Amino acid sequence: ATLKYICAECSSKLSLSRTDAVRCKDCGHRILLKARTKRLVQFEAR
Amino acid sequence: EEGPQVKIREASKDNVDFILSNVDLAMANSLRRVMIAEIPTLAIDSVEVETNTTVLADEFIAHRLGLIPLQSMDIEQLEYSRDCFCEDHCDKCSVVLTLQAFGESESTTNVYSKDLVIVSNLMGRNIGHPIIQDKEGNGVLICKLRKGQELKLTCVAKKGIAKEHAKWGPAAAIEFEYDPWNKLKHTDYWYEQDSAKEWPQSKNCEYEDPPNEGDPFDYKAQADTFYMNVESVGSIPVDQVVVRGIDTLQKKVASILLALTQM
Amino acid sequence: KVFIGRLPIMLRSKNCYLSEATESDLYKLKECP
Amino acid sequence: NQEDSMIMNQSSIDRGLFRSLFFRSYMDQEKKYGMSITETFEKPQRTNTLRMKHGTYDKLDDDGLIAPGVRVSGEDVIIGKTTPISSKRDASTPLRSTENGIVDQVLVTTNQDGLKFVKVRVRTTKIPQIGDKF
Amino acid sequence: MIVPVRCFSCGKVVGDKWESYLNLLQEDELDEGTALSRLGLKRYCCRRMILTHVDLIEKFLRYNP
Ligand SMILES: [Zn+2]
Ligand SMILES: [Zn+2]
Ligand SMILES: [Zn+2]
């Protein structure tokens, strides 16, 4: 359910920790993103 | 009938063109301002974001959300959040909307103001419903989605005036004119050869009489009779944009008179 | 036969990948057309 | 509007006139000191050395990196990194003092030589204020 | 980059109009000027709003993830 990291290219959730290799599970490419906080953010409508 | 008279020329669901006979300029203008800023409306003023797989910035959308017009009919039977006693908001002071959107189709899936849906209880009062003047019944494109582009928001709309943010503006543009033939000499028309031939005559020239050359200037002449056109954005119906404009201004004057009594 | 260093490539030149990519290929390659 | 200045419609400014979007990318890398003496990305606290930043670390996750939702502001720590010696000296990168905003996109990759490479984007919206040139 | 909701100048909700504007030009093969007034855009403040907008959102959508 909850995701640590997301792959940038194939947008496949990778939910990894340190020393798990910065590569993706299928395509190689290390790109990897951090995927949004579950502590929901609010904005003023102005 | 009474003090200042009124003659409605043209009327619609969103435009009233009338003539304000037997008034002072100051009063006719004070009414203009009130309609612009001081009338209270309901507008989205909190956008809690859950998921935004969109090409668009959360705040871009958030700003955009407030600018959507919402039914503000029974607004006067809703407290300003700031005056209510709850921490933040409730049903007595706020209308809660919920937007869920996802691109199911291969083709671009669009998000419309119709797609917002009320989650708070309206207590049986005409409020919150987004204004849809659209022929196709969608009204206002919030944004567009691709494949798995998701958008989940919760919106809290509250009472407020346009003097705080133009989103609470119940009116579009108030057309205002007096003395079409410059008889009061409130302008000195810039010209090249003939001021009269260079400057176009307003539609209001038919509602007054041309001055006649051989007639000297009326230094005693004063401006009453103002040709106006109040346009509603949708929140409040045109008739009320005027009526509430008159009541709000009355209340402002009243507060002064009332404050003078405490002194 | 023998390696003698790496040469920087100009974007959209002969030896750059993008010289032959179509409008849709670029979007796919996350590059602005 | 006198002497090369101008008056602007605040009512128009609200409706979205001349609104900007400002982004800034903050970058960091785990430094290597020859004999596998490498720095690490982590949310640190006290520990023996005590060389650390004023700003709040409490916004960082356990990887020493803020999640892309968070609203950053003062001298708030954006990247938490640490250097040992012969142990919390600090190596953390705080948000530019003047600035404030929302964490936009955070990427974790690898530099050509196998080190942890991190770029953090911070999005904000710029409203046409008073000293604003046009 | 996505049609502005409301004209900056007078605040007439220009938001809904877009899709209908594009359809008047494409489908009803109308000239931009007539199409504009057909959507009810009378003042030039509202008129520039639609007439002068560049829908970059459609470009951004072309990017896959
Ligand atoms: Zn991948
Ligand atoms: Zn309340
Ligand atoms: Zn306008």
Side-chain angles (χ1 to χ4, degrees), chain E:
Chain E
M1 181 201 293
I2 223 281
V3 218
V5 173
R6 269 133 133 162
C7 154
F8 315 129
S9 292
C10 76
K12 213 297 142 269
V13 257
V14 154
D16 45 4
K17 267 93 200 71
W18 187 243
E19 286 190 55
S20 311
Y21 169 75
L22 255 45
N23 230 84
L24 275 151
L25 311 148
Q26 169 260 136
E27 269 204 341
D28 291 80
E29 278 184 79
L30 261 180
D31 67 287
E32 332 94 315
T34 310
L36 275 151
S37 271
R38 201 150 301 186
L39 306 132
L41 301 134
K42 143 73 195 173
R43 30 225 191 294
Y44 48 110
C45 65
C46 313
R47 272 168 153 272
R48 57 101 205 259
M49 220 54 59
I50 281 293
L51 164 69
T52 223
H53 162 242
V54 222
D55 217 20
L56 298 132
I57 187 150
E58 290 281 18
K59 295 255 167 65
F60 304 148
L61 290 152
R62 288 216 62 189
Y63 294 94
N64 189 87

Coordinates of all heavy atoms in Angstrom, one line a residue, chain E:
Chain E
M1 N -2.2 27.6 -21.3 CA -2.0 26.5 -20.4 C -3.3 26.5 -19.6 O -3.3 27.1 -18.6 CB -0.8 26.8 -19.5 CG -0.5 25.8 -18.5 SD 0.4 26.4 -17.1 CE 2.0 26.9 -18.0
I2 N -4.3 25.8 -20.2 CA -5.7 25.7 -19.6 C -6.3 27.1 -19.4 O -5.8 28.0 -18.8 CB -5.7 24.8 -18.3 CG1 -6.9 23.8 -18.3 CG2 -5.6 25.4 -17.0 CD1 -8.2 24.3 -17.9
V3 N -7.5 27.3 -20.1 CA -8.3 28.5 -20.1 C -8.5 29.1 -18.8 O -9.0 28.4 -17.9 CB -9.8 28.1 -20.5 CG1 -10.4 29.1 -21.4 CG2 -9.9 26.7 -21.0
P4 N -8.2 30.4 -18.6 CA -8.5 31.0 -17.3 C -10.0 31.0 -17.0 O -10.8 31.1 -17.9 CB -8.0 32.5 -17.5 CG -7.2 32.5 -18.6 CD -7.7 31.4 -19.5
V5 N -10.3 30.7 -15.7 CA -11.7 30.8 -15.2 C -11.7 32.3 -15.0 O -10.7 32.9 -14.5 CB -11.8 30.1 -13.8 CG1 -13.2 30.4 -13.2 CG2 -11.5 28.7 -13.9
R6 N -12.8 33.0 -15.3 CA -12.9 34.5 -15.2 C -11.8 35.4 -15.9 O -10.6 35.2 -15.7 CB -13.1 34.9 -13.7 CG -14.5 35.0 -13.3 CD -14.8 34.4 -11.9 NE -15.6 35.2 -11.0 CZ -16.2 34.8 -10.0 NH1 -16.2 33.5 -9.6 NH2 -16.9 35.6 -9.2
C7 N -12.3 36.4 -16.6 CA -11.6 37.4 -17.2 C -10.9 38.3 -16.1 O -11.6 38.6 -15.1 CB -12.5 38.3 -18.1 SG -11.9 40.0 -18.3
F8 N -9.6 38.5 -16.2 CA -8.9 39.3 -15.2 C -9.6 40.6 -14.9 O -10.0 40.8 -13.7 CB -7.4 39.5 -15.5 CG -6.6 38.3 -16.1 CD1 -5.9 38.4 -17.3 CD2 -6.6 37.1 -15.4 CE1 -5.2 37.3 -17.8 CE2 -5.9 36.0 -15.9 CZ -5.2 36.1 -17.1
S9 N -9.8 41.4 -15.9 CA -10.4 42.8 -15.9 C -11.7 42.9 -15.2 O -11.8 43.7 -14.2 CB -10.4 43.4 -17.3 OG -9.1 43.6 -17.8
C10 N -12.8 42.3 -15.7 CA -14.1 42.5 -15.1 C -14.7 41.2 -14.5 O -15.7 41.3 -13.8 CB -15.1 43.0 -16.2 SG -15.6 41.8 -17.4
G11 N -14.0 40.1 -14.6 CA -14.4 38.8 -14.0 C -15.6 38.1 -14.5 O -16.4 37.5 -13.7
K12 N -15.9 38.2 -15.8 CA -17.0 37.4 -16.4 C -16.4 36.0 -16.6 O -15.3 35.9 -17.2 CB -17.4 37.9 -17.8 CG -18.9 37.8 -18.1 CD -19.4 36.3 -18.2 CE -20.8 36.1 -17.6 NZ -20.8 35.8 -16.1
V13 N -17.1 34.9 -16.1 CA -16.6 33.5 -16.2 C -16.4 33.1 -17.6 O -17.3 32.6 -18.3 CB -17.5 32.6 -15.4 CG1 -16.8 32.2 -14.1 CG2 -18.9 33.1 -15.1
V14 N -15.2 33.2 -18.0 CA -14.7 32.8 -19.3 C -14.4 31.3 -19.4 O -14.3 30.7 -20.5 CB -13.5 33.8 -19.6 CG1 -12.5 33.2 -20.6 CG2 -14.0 35.2 -20.0
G15 N -14.3 30.7 -18.2 CA -14.0 29.3 -18.0 C -14.6 28.2 -18.8 O -14.0 27.4 -19.5
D16 N -16.0 28.2 -18.8 CA -16.8 27.2 -19.6 C -16.7 27.4 -21.1 O -16.8 26.4 -21.9 CB -18.3 27.3 -19.2 CG -18.9 28.7 -19.0 OD1 -18.2 29.7 -19.3 OD2 -20.1 28.8 -18.6
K17 N -16.6 28.6 -21.6 CA -16.5 29.1 -23.0 C -15.6 28.3 -23.9 O -15.9 28.1 -25.0 CB -16.3 30.6 -23.0 CG -17.5 31.5 -23.0 CD -18.0 32.0 -21.7 CE -19.4 32.4 -21.7 NZ -20.4 31.3 -21.8
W18 N -14.3 28.0 -23.4 CA -13.3 27.4 -24.2 C -13.7 26.4 -25.2 O -13.4 26.5 -26.4 CB -12.1 26.9 -23.5 CG -11.0 26.5 -24.3 CD1 -10.4 25.2 -24.5 CD2 -10.1 27.3 -25.1 NE1 -9.3 25.2 -25.3 CE2 -9.1 26.5 -25.7 CE3 -10.1 28.7 -25.4 CZ2 -8.1 27.0 -26.5 CZ3 -9.1 29.2 -26.2 CH2 -8.2 28.4 -26.8
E19 N -14.1 25.2 -24.7 CA -14.4 24.1 -25.6 C -15.4 24.5 -26.7 O -15.2 24.2 -27.8 CB -14.9 22.9 -24.7 CG -13.7 22.3 -24.0 CD -13.9 21.0 -23.3 OE1 -14.4 20.0 -24.0 OE2 -13.5 20.9 -22.1
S20 N -16.4 25.3 -26.3 CA -17.5 25.8 -27.2 C -16.9 26.8 -28.2 O -17.3 26.8 -29.3 CB -18.6 26.5 -26.4 OG -19.0 25.6 -25.3
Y21 N -15.8 27.6 -27.8 CA -15.1 28.5 -28.7 C -14.4 27.8 -29.8 O -14.6 28.1 -31.0 CB -14.2 29.5 -28.0 CG -13.2 30.3 -28.8 CD1 -13.7 31.4 -29.5 CD2 -11.9 30.0 -28.9 CE1 -12.8 32.2 -30.3 CE2 -11.0 30.8 -29.6 CZ -11.4 31.9 -30.3 OH -10.6 32.6 -31.1
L22 N -13.6 26.8 -29.5 CA -12.9 25.9 -30.4 C -13.8 25.2 -31.4 O -13.4 25.1 -32.6 CB -12.1 24.9 -29.6 CG -10.6 25.1 -29.4 CD1 -10.3 26.6 -29.1 CD2 -10.0 24.2 -28.4
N23 N -14.9 24.8 -30.9 CA -16.0 24.1 -31.7 C -16.7 25.1 -32.7 O -17.2 24.6 -33.7 CB -16.9 23.5 -30.8 CG -17.2 22.0 -31.1 OD1 -16.4 21.1 -30.8 ND2 -18.2 21.8 -31.9
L24 N -16.7 26.4 -32.3 CA -17.4 27.3 -33.2 C -16.5 27.5 -34.4 O -17.0 27.7 -35.6 CB -17.7 28.6 -32.5 CG -19.0 28.7 -31.8 CD1 -18.9 29.6 -30.6 CD2 -20.1 29.1 -32.7
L25 N -15.2 27.6 -34.2 CA -14.2 27.8 -35.3 C -14.0 26.6 -36.2 O -13.9 26.7 -37.4 CB -12.8 28.2 -34.7 CG -12.9 29.2 -33.6 CD1 -11.8 29.0 -32.6 CD2 -12.8 30.6 -34.3
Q26 N -13.8 25.4 -35.6 CA -13.6 24.2 -36.3 C -14.8 23.7 -37.0 O -14.9 23.8 -38.2 CB -13.1 23.1 -35.3 CG -13.0 21.6 -35.8 CD -14.2 20.8 -35.4 OE1 -14.8 20.0 -36.2 NE2 -14.6 20.8 -34.1
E27 N -15.9 23.4 -36.2 CA -17.2 22.9 -36.7 C -17.9 23.9 -37.5 O -18.1 23.7 -38.7 CB -18.0 22.3 -35.5 CG -17.8 20.8 -35.3 CD -19.0 20.1 -34.6 OE1 -19.9 20.8 -34.0 OE2 -19.1 18.9 -34.6
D28 N -18.4 25.0 -36.8 CA -19.3 26.0 -37.5 C -18.5 26.9 -38.4 O -19.0 27.9 -38.9 CB -20.1 26.7 -36.5 CG -21.2 25.8 -35.9 OD1 -20.9 25.0 -34.9 OD2 -22.4 25.9 -36.3
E29 N -17.2 26.5 -38.7 CA -16.3 27.3 -39.6 C -16.5 28.8 -39.6 O -16.5 29.5 -40.6 CB -16.4 26.7 -41.1 CG -15.6 25.5 -41.3 CD -15.7 25.0 -42.8 OE1 -15.0 25.6 -43.6 OE2 -16.5 24.1 -43.1
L30 N -16.7 29.3 -38.4 CA -16.9 30.7 -38.1 C -15.5 31.4 -38.0 O -14.5 30.8 -37.6 CB -17.7 30.9 -36.8 CG -19.1 31.2 -36.9 CD1 -19.7 31.4 -35.6 CD2 -19.4 32.5 -37.7
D31 N -15.5 32.7 -38.2 CA -14.3 33.5 -38.0 C -14.2 33.8 -36.5 O -15.3 33.9 -35.9 CB -14.3 34.8 -38.8 CG -15.3 35.9 -38.4 OD1 -16.5 35.6 -38.7 OD2 -14.9 36.9 -37.9
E32 N -13.0 33.9 -36.0 CA -12.7 34.1 -34.6 C -13.6 35.2 -33.9 O -14.2 34.9 -32.9 CB -11.2 34.3 -34.3 CG -10.3 33.7 -35.4 CD -9.9 34.6 -36.5 OE1 -10.7 35.3 -37.1 OE2 -8.7 34.6 -36.9
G33 N -13.6 36.3 -34.6 CA -14.4 37.5 -34.2 C -15.9 37.2 -33.9 O -16.4 37.6 -32.8
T34 N -16.6 36.6 -34.8 CA -18.0 36.3 -34.7 C -18.2 35.2 -33.7 O -19.2 35.3 -32.9 CB -18.6 35.9 -36.1 OG1 -18.2 36.8 -37.1 CG2 -20.1 35.7 -36.1
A35 N -17.4 34.2 -33.7 CA -17.4 33.1 -32.7 C -17.3 33.7 -31.3 O -18.2 33.3 -30.5 CB -16.2 32.1 -33.0
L36 N -16.4 34.6 -31.0 CA -16.2 35.3 -29.8 C -17.6 35.9 -29.3 O -18.0 35.6 -28.2 CB -15.1 36.3 -29.8 CG -13.7 35.9 -29.6 CD1 -12.8 36.8 -30.4 CD2 -13.3 35.9 -28.2
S37 N -18.2 36.7 -30.1 CA -19.4 37.4 -29.7 C -20.6 36.4 -29.5 O -21.5 36.7 -28.7 CB -19.8 38.5 -30.7 OG -19.1 39.7 -30.2
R38 N -20.5 35.3 -30.2 CA -21.5 34.2 -30.1 C -21.5 33.6 -28.7 O -22.6 33.3 -28.2 CB -21.4 33.1 -31.2 CG -22.7 32.3 -31.4 CD -22.8 31.9 -32.9 NE -22.8 33.0 -33.8 CZ -23.1 32.8 -35.1 NH1 -23.3 31.6 -35.6 NH2 -23.0 33.9 -35.9
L39 N -20.3 33.4 -28.1 CA -20.2 32.9 -26.8 C -20.6 34.0 -25.7 O -20.8 33.7 -24.5 CB -18.7 32.5 -26.5 CG -18.2 31.5 -27.5 CD1 -16.8 32.0 -27.9 CD2 -18.1 30.1 -26.9
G40 N -20.9 35.2 -26.3 CA -21.4 36.3 -25.5 C -20.4 37.3 -25.0 O -20.7 38.2 -24.3
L41 N -19.1 37.1 -25.5 CA -18.0 38.0 -25.1 C -18.1 39.3 -25.8 O -17.8 39.5 -27.0 CB -16.7 37.3 -25.4 CG -16.5 35.9 -24.7 CD1 -15.9 34.9 -25.6 CD2 -15.5 36.1 -23.6
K42 N -18.7 40.3 -25.0 CA -19.0 41.7 -25.6 C -17.8 42.6 -25.4 O -17.3 43.2 -26.3 CB -20.3 42.3 -25.1 CG -20.4 43.8 -24.8 CD -20.4 44.8 -26.0 CE -20.1 46.2 -25.6 NZ -19.9 47.2 -26.8
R43 N -17.3 42.7 -24.1 CA -16.2 43.7 -23.9 C -14.8 43.1 -24.3 O -14.7 41.8 -24.2 CB -16.1 44.4 -22.6 CG -16.7 43.6 -21.4 CD -17.5 44.5 -20.5 NE -17.9 43.8 -19.3 CZ -18.6 42.7 -19.1 NH1 -19.1 42.1 -20.2 NH2 -18.8 42.2 -17.9
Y44 N -13.9 43.9 -24.8 CA -12.6 43.4 -25.2 C -11.7 42.8 -24.1 O -10.8 42.1 -24.4 CB -11.9 44.5 -26.0 CG -11.8 45.9 -25.4 CD1 -10.6 46.4 -24.9 CD2 -12.9 46.7 -25.5 CE1 -10.5 47.7 -24.4 CE2 -12.9 48.0 -25.0 CZ -11.7 48.5 -24.5 OH -11.6 49.8 -24.1
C45 N -12.0 43.1 -22.8 CA -11.3 42.6 -21.7 C -11.6 41.1 -21.6 O -10.7 40.3 -21.5 CB -11.7 43.3 -20.4 SG -13.5 43.0 -19.9
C46 N -12.8 40.7 -21.9 CA -13.3 39.3 -21.9 C -12.8 38.7 -23.2 O -12.3 37.6 -23.2 CB -14.8 39.2 -21.8 SG -15.5 40.2 -20.5
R47 N -12.9 39.5 -24.3 CA -12.5 39.1 -25.7 C -11.1 38.7 -25.7 O -10.8 37.5 -26.2 CB -12.9 40.1 -26.7 CG -14.3 39.9 -27.2 CD -14.8 41.0 -28.1 NE -15.8 40.6 -29.0 CZ -15.5 40.1 -30.2 NH1 -14.3 40.1 -30.6 NH2 -16.5 39.7 -31.0
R48 N -10.1 39.5 -25.2 CA -8.7 39.1 -25.2 C -8.6 37.8 -24.5 O -8.0 36.8 -25.1 CB -7.7 40.1 -24.8 CG -7.9 40.7 -23.4 CD -7.0 40.2 -22.3 NE -7.7 40.4 -21.1 CZ -7.5 41.3 -20.2 NH1 -6.4 42.1 -20.4 NH2 -8.2 41.5 -19.1
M49 N -9.2 37.6 -23.3 CA -9.1 36.4 -22.5 C -9.1 35.1 -23.3 O -8.2 34.3 -23.1 CB -10.2 36.4 -21.4 CG -9.8 35.9 -20.1 SD -8.3 36.8 -19.4 CE -8.9 38.3 -19.3
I50 N -10.1 34.9 -24.2 CA -10.3 33.7 -25.0 C -9.4 33.8 -26.3 O -8.7 32.8 -26.6 CB -11.8 33.5 -25.3 CG1 -12.5 32.9 -24.1 CG2 -12.1 32.8 -26.6 CD1 -12.1 31.5 -23.8
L51 N -9.6 34.9 -27.0 CA -9.0 35.2 -28.3 C -7.5 35.1 -28.3 O -6.9 34.6 -29.3 CB -9.4 36.6 -28.8 CG -8.6 37.3 -29.9 CD1 -8.8 36.6 -31.2 CD2 -9.0 38.8 -30.0
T52 N -6.8 35.4 -27.2 CA -5.4 35.5 -27.0 C -4.8 34.4 -26.1 O -3.6 34.4 -25.8 CB -5.1 37.0 -26.5 OG1 -4.0 37.5 -27.2 CG2 -5.0 37.1 -25.0
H53 N -5.6 33.4 -25.7 CA -5.1 32.3 -24.8 C -4.5 31.2 -25.6 O -5.0 30.8 -26.6 CB -6.1 31.8 -23.8 CG -5.8 30.4 -23.2 ND1 -6.6 29.4 -23.4 CD2 -4.8 30.1 -22.5 CE1 -6.1 28.3 -22.8 NE2 -5.0 28.7 -22.2
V54 N -3.3 30.7 -25.1 CA -2.5 29.6 -25.7 C -2.5 28.3 -24.8 O -1.6 28.3 -23.9 CB -1.0 30.0 -26.1 CG1 -0.7 29.3 -27.4 CG2 -0.8 31.5 -26.1
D55 N -3.4 27.4 -25.0 CA -3.7 26.1 -24.3 C -2.5 25.1 -24.3 O -2.6 24.0 -24.8 CB -4.9 25.4 -24.9 CG -5.8 24.7 -24.0 OD1 -5.8 25.0 -22.8 OD2 -6.7 23.9 -24.4
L56 N -1.4 25.5 -23.6 CA -0.2 24.7 -23.4 C -0.5 23.4 -22.7 O 0.3 22.5 -22.8 CB 0.9 25.4 -22.7 CG 1.4 26.7 -23.4 CD1 1.5 27.8 -22.5 CD2 2.8 26.4 -24.0
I57 N -1.6 23.3 -21.9 CA -2.0 22.1 -21.2 C -1.9 20.9 -22.1 O -1.4 19.8 -21.8 CB -3.3 22.1 -20.4 CG1 -3.4 20.8 -19.5 CG2 -4.5 22.4 -21.2 CD1 -4.2 20.9 -18.2
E58 N -2.5 21.0 -23.4 CA -2.5 20.0 -24.4 C -1.1 19.4 -24.7 O -1.0 18.3 -25.1 CB -3.3 20.4 -25.6 CG -4.8 20.5 -25.3 CD -5.6 19.2 -25.3 OE1 -5.0 18.1 -25.2 OE2 -6.9 19.3 -25.4
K59 N -0.1 20.3 -24.7 CA 1.3 19.9 -25.0 C 1.8 19.0 -23.9 O 2.4 18.0 -24.1 CB 2.2 21.1 -25.2 CG 1.8 22.0 -26.4 CD 2.8 21.8 -27.6 CE 2.2 22.4 -28.8 NZ 2.1 23.8 -28.8
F60 N 1.7 19.5 -22.6 CA 2.1 18.9 -21.4 C 1.5 17.5 -21.2 O 2.1 16.6 -20.5 CB 1.7 19.7 -20.2 CG 2.1 21.2 -20.1 CD1 1.4 22.2 -19.5 CD2 3.4 21.5 -20.6 CE1 1.8 23.5 -19.5 CE2 3.8 22.9 -20.6 CZ 3.0 23.8 -20.0
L61 N 0.3 17.3 -21.6 CA -0.4 16.0 -21.6 C 0.3 15.0 -22.4 O 0.3 13.8 -22.1 CB -1.9 16.1 -22.0 CG -2.7 16.9 -21.0 CD1 -3.9 17.6 -21.7 CD2 -3.2 16.0 -19.8
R62 N 0.9 15.4 -23.6 CA 1.7 14.5 -24.5 C 2.8 13.8 -23.8 O 3.2 12.7 -24.4 CB 2.1 15.3 -25.7 CG 1.0 15.6 -26.7 CD 1.3 15.6 -28.1 NE 1.7 14.2 -28.5 CZ 2.2 13.9 -29.7 NH1 2.4 14.9 -30.6 NH2 2.6 12.7 -30.0
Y63 N 3.3 14.2 -22.7 CA 4.4 13.6 -21.9 C 3.7 12.5 -21.1 O 2.8 12.7 -20.3 CB 5.1 14.6 -21.0 CG 5.9 15.7 -21.7 CD1 5.3 16.9 -22.1 CD2 7.2 15.4 -22.2 CE1 6.0 17.8 -22.8 CE2 7.9 16.3 -22.9 CZ 7.3 17.5 -23.2 OH 8.0 18.5 -24.0
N64 N 4.2 11.3 -21.3 CA 3.7 10.0 -20.8 C 3.4 9.9 -19.3 O 2.2 9.9 -19.0 CB 4.6 8.8 -21.2 CG 4.1 7.4 -21.0 OD1 3.4 6.8 -21.8 ND2 4.5 6.8 -19.8
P65 N 4.3 9.8 -18.3 CA 3.9 9.6 -16.9 C 3.5 10.9 -16.2 O 2.5 11.0 -15.6 CB 5.2 9.0 -16.2 CG 6.2 8.8 -17.3 CD 5.8 9.8 -18.4

